[PDB]
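Key idea: predict the complex, not the pieces.
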Amino acid sequence: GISYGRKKRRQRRRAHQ
RNA sequence: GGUCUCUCUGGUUAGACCAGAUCUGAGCCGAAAAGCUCUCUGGCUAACUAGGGAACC
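Result:
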């Protein structure tokens, strides 16, 4: 998860339930 | 003439490597902000291998 893009995906994934 | 020493190309395998994918790939954890592990695709890096070239004897 060190990559900034995964943080975006992790946040996007959390936002969609 | 011999030799993978270097280098490039193809291939195989791997990788606490770089990107992207649940704006619809999956699991784990927390009360939560978050965190952890994967899978798929492109690339990179390393090992090994064949071949071209170079280098050395």
